[PDB]
Symmetry: D2
Subunit: 508 residues, 4 copies
Amino acid sequence: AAISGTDEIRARAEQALTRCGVDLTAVKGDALTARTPLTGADLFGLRAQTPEDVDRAVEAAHTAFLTWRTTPAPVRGALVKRFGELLTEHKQDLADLVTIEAGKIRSEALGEVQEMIDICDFAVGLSRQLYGRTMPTERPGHRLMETWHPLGVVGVISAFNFPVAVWAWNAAVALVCGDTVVWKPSELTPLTALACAALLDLAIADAGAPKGLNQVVVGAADVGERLVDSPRVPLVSATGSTRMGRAVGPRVAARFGRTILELGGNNAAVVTPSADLDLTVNAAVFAAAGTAGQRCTTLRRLIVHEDIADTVVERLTAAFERLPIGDPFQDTTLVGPLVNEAAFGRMREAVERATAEGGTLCAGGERQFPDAAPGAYYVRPALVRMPAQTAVVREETFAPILYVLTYRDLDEAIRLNNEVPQGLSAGIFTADQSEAERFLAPDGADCGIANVNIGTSGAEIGGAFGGEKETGGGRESGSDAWRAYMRRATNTVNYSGRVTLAQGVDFS
Amino acid sequence: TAAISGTDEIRARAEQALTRCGVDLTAVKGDALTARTPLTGADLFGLRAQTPEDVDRAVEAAHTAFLTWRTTPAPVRGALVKRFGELLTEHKQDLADLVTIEAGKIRSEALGEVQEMIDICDFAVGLSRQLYGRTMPTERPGHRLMETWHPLGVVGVISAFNFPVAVWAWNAAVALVCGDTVVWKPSELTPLTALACAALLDLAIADAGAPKGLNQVVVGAADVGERLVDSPRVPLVSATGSTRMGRAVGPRVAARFGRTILELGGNNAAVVTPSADLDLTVNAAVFAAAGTAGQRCTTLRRLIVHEDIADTVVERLTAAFERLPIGDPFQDTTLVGPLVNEAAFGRMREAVERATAEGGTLCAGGERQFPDAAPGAYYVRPALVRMPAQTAVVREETFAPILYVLTYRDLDEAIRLNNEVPQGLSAGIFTADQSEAERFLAPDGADCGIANVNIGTSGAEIGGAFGGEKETGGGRESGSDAWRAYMRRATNTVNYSGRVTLAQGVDFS
Amino acid sequence: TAAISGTDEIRARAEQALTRCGVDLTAVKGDALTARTPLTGADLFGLRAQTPEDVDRAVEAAHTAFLTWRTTPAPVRGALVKRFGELLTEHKQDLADLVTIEAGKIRSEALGEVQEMIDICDFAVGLSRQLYGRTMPTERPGHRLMETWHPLGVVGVISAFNFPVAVWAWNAAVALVCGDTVVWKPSELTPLTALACAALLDLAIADAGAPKGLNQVVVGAADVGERLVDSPRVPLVSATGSTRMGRAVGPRVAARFGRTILELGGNNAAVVTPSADLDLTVNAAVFAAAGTAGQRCTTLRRLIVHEDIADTVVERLTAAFERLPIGDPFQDTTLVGPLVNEAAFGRMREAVERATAEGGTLCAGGERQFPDAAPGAYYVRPALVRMPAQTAVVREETFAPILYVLTYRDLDEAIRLNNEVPQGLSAGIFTADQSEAERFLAPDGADCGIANVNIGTSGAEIGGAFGGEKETGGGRESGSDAWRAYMRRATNTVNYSGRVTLAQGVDFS
Amino acid sequence: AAISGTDEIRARAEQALTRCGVDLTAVKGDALTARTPLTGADLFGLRAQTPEDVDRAVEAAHTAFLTWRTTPAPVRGALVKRFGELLTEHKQDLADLVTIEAGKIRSEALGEVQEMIDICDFAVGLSRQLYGRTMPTERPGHRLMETWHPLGVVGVISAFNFPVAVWAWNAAVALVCGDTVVWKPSELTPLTALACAALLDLAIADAGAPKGLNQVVVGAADVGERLVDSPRVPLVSATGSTRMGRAVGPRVAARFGRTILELGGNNAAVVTPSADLDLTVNAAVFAAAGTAGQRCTTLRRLIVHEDIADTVVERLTAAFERLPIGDPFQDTTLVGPLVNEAAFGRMREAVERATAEGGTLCAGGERQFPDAAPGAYYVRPALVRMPAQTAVVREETFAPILYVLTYRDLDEAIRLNNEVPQGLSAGIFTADQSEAERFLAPDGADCGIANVNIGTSGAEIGGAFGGEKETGGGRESGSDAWRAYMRRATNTVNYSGRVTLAQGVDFS
């Protein structure tokens, strides 16, 4: 294959950075090296933050918060509108960085940037809503209401695979809610975040807003840990592996803070006897192989009825063999590279484990064109037929592997969907009205997202996004997910000039 | 001076109340745990306890029950709650005897707590036809999008001594209409209240034909509480108690990817501005500080009074405190019953001494009343302590009637004084000034979960979400959409178009 | 053949039921209006009526009551409704006798209608702590913005013969918790049901210590209804009745700047697709078409069946209709009681003849049963008429059991056939196909206020907003936030900043 | 004074029209003449619509509706976002037309255009919301929900005094709700609406939307009447005099259609003994005199406590005498002209009536600089002290007249506020906490808008806008006012395969 050169990738990144307003001389250094999975090569070195720098960032965000929180929410919304426009103006530059750092294909990178723009627009809406309630009180001559107030500094820790959209869900919402933001991006994807931050900084200057509303702290897990421990950060939104949940969640809880946890997924689709197989095959392929199986919403388990299981595996086999793998800057490419060597190693280990546990590799799994970029890990998605939901099937391997399991009764398909520790998304493919409803019912699929005739990535801005069980319970983006960024007050107002006298005794 | 009922007379009243609520005394009596009363400080009789193994058996029973209950239509689940509230109404007096006996509350407050149970039952029956999710537009042609709410599982309820029936009721009425089941670990100090509650609910269940395992009481100390907290079968723990306990429960449950409602300590203040109606303020402040002998979580503990009226406000409260009738909580004349135990009396005296060491002046109260009338019991006159600053003891919750009086000049200083403590439950402002009232409730005002105007820190009701911020723990109970913490959200996209976005235009069919 | 109870035996049962519900028979008897029963078609006894003057006096009493009720805390207003529902529970059987006696409904449906009253009372008690407005941000610094809901005034309730207690209950339980008062004009065909309802509510009111004028019944014909509609003291008229009546009431009330809830005729259809479960479909279709002898507003009147299964569906319904037990509605065996009166029988026969003149084939039923068993009463077998097109008679609501069967090929043709009529209350689709189900409920699907999947046109409940579109009149009753039509919205901006935007920067101080 | 010439006003209008995309040769004619209250002169003639043209407009809007209603709401929102941007781009051109036709000062014209932009932004938010409910059903194996669907063609009839914002409240909301719009603007302000329509038409082309989404029908009340009678228009939003309500409301009701009625106002403010008098005087002056007293929210009644009544009247007298009256294109101008001669005649007649009913003219009422533009009616706001709330005080005269009434007890101030037939807005000025709450309580002011320490124009996008009593009960713009543009469906879904068997009898 023909893969973009490291020199040209580097020059495209520097151009995209300077066009988004980044000062390259100010951000360059030698504490952390930016990289690209397209070739595996280093791009250039960057300054990183000390743990002392995190605390200085928190103090700056908190100082800004004290002004932002009495700035009227619709004025705060004017800022987010302005940022949305700058994102629109620089959509292709930002997308190039997403492709360069995350390795996702160009169309998906553009879609991730559009997601940021769409949440800005939604947040501008929210800025005139953030609804509490007015309600009756049992007390004569009193009034009762419930109000919502800005919480404070929000710590946002994000992953490599959606390096701009996850932050955008949190920042757009947090900013209209009157919060400020300290962002600790993945050590794998710092360039996207610097570009994001400079665009928002321009928005801040144009809008006359306070300077410290958003702050980026570049570094590894230790910088995240200091952010997590801060007594001035009442909400940490953390996205990453299920592993992280056991560290972050209890730590924040121990200091009486709040978390939004968006952890791993292990998403299944059920394919029933009446499923439209052309539709099912297209949906399953795109959800399993898309982003080189590196979405939290990636399709990893296909629970197929035994009467159609052979036809389904045959058709998925043929499709997997035809998937075009390549440079994610080429429009013909559908599957770009895995993020690094370790990711390839873990994929290979899961597949070896699955065969040891009684599985059969049906298609895929081989590394593609290793000599064309020996530092990069381009792999064909693996399709693995399994005789039961064994150990490896229940673990999230962050790579494109689709395990196929069979069932007969719908309640067993539901059981198999729910048996895993993760709880993000689930889908059912069926022409049958009652089966679709049974899958979505209280005793149906147990996930945060449960869909009919669309796959495990079927989600959108207006929906609250997140999962149950070991996916951590958090919600972002749509519906009333904004409530996690604000504090509720219940207010009783007496206008009668009287209080109930205990026992009829009076101290006037 | 006052006459206090005898341990024998209290015991017999307790046994009557239990029997009438359907408790089998033979079956619950034993030697593991002792029932007691703060009226005399004496033990009443021994009870059987549950081991940590029994807790696990009770959780699994509750889970089996949940597997049926979650597909029981919520309005049918509501019918169960309506019937329960019918039995509470019928046994209101009996259940209120047990509340007074175990918590030391005066009769009118004991009746008020039982009515609160009845009111949340009524509210929950309403919720049982609501539990609203949402329908909304989708960007996808030929698709539909919605949000649905589902039953969660077994709910672990850990309650305190001071509201021995209402706190569980808030949780259980709501949990049950939401399709959940309940395992309740009541205070080791107040088991009989819980046994009577559970026996009445068991009757309701039998009348409704509902599953047997919907609610269960596990009796014992904090070690029984810990086994409930650790169960991987309990996705929600509602824990009510001291701030200290939060650092145990919240992280433990978080570590196993569970959810908590934490309802922890308060250290609640009221601001008295120069335009305050002093008669309203003094009466409000008295009830809020002295009621339940300062053992509500919403008890008024700090009074932040403008310097121009501080001297007159202190005189009036000094005189009001000196006139509080302290006595047996079964007598109609009693406004202040006893403290729960000796430990609570010790901490009260320790705080008053510290406050006077830290520059404070004791203005009224703080002395033990008629010790020889009931030597095992601790009846005290509420303390009023004028303080020159907000020092360490002022910032601690001592669970006792102590009102600290602090002065201020600018409203923003009053607000900072309110917000400076680690707790964040409740706050009030007494003022006739429109602007001050709104400033106190504003985003840069009082930082508490409840913020009121011209009514004290115990001013809340069923329809409001009840709870606090900061070291109070963030949880909400009872009103508004507090029910959501008892269910799980699902976001559902339904494709009826027969087609899917083709990635890069490629069709694999 | 069947045995029908005698007018004397019905009268005596009615008098018992009234007395037991607290009606004073001496005081309501008179010679202006006659109580009657469809069981025999006979008059029972005479009643006093109200003149148009009496209506005006009753409205003014209701308004005086409203002036107190609107400042009564909604949760206290809820306590009244809870007590009312306690009396309905206690007198369920008695009130259900009167429903069967006046509306001709079978016992189980009469009991179901009274339970519906009880259920809306329970739902309303919940609402009484909700009635939610909103708090929201304002663009103005140092300001606050909110939305509040307030009591409206006197609510005029005009009801029909076929649901003589539930319709009023939906309106009144909700109106009363919302701070409103009620003036009720029941059908001239069903006054006794209303008198018994009102007498029980008057007892509740006395027990609660609530104002006397909260609810009043005005007995008489459509001229008493018109005076209520015209009153400038009645800001809301809820009118239930024929489509014809809407063109009277809606414009009259609009002309005086008042509000209406209009709940008018239906002409409801179900679509039967080739994948339909025929056993489910046939049973559903039978109950929906034949129940209440086709005198529910949600009665199934049109069946739109796919041509591939039309012959088999018609055979099965032909046989089911021929087996419907028609009889005295007090007997447990009866599924179909009588039509309300002779006029209704005349219109039924007139429609069947027109349908057969318009190309239709009568497949089953339509004949008067046992005329000589009760010569004044009109018991009929439901009619099943196969039609070649949707002609004029098919598009009219005839208030009688007639099911027209129309065939289709494409789902979009079924949908157009559903939507082609002037009414828009209720619709159903019977199908096992996921896509067809969703297409029927989509924006370009069934255009009705109620659209169901695998359940008939009478599939609705308390928690849902009940009502229709088009000539059904747009009003909603009972569930969701239907309560909003009984209150007025206020939008409140509160400035606590002490300053105002200066126009052109000019300061006039 | 120095007033803009008719020639230069004409040329500014033609320029603003052509810059907004209007074809001047296509819209010109001689059926209706566009005009300006700045000089009173005719600008130029226009084509007008026949009643047959209205029915052709309805048919075109309905044809568009059949496509728009299955276009996903967020896609519909993309159009409104785009229109918001075009409005932003042409904000000054549109504002010049508003000043030219409505006669309002330049800053207010700019503010009315910004209102359009702000509702577009809010509607873009709504396009991912339009919330119904999901809820429990009492039936085993069933599911229950409430959904909202597009209604159809919306008839929008608007007044002269807000010639762009009223339409924008209705169109932005109606378009995201999946409705289409037929707009019948005031015969006094057709140029603004043509400009509006051409900007939205450009948005439609850029967005790929259907052509007939919005249609303008130019003419007088007879064209409105035909629109009102149409069986294909299920919702008429009508703004105008209380007079219109008695015609439109019953007509639409007679054909089972829906209305939103936004009729006259007669708004009062209560000034209590603790009122901040500097604040009260500024607020009252701006609300009484602003827009030459030609807002529906205009302050017309001031209910002042007797202890401060003399000081308040003295201070208002001095302020009214100082008000600068002038060309609304001059930034020094605060009060521009009245709309026409008839408006001046009615003002003069009310003032003569008020003095006959026992009143005293304290300040204002005189026509200003008549020779400078003898076709134009520039008047100083009138301040009239009244001994009781007489007949004229209770009628809305659409001109700047402020009646002053005295009270002693707050309940009488509330009574006087509520005694009038109109019910739009009300305000109370007070430093007293209980008085403010009493004014807003269930037995307080009876209006649609009730405010504290801000006047009768205190309202904003996020609030639902409208009134009670003879103001007609309608709501527009904020909160959930969108519900009037859609139809509710209650949906019960059976997935159990069972129905309840009546009496245990079965027909299987």
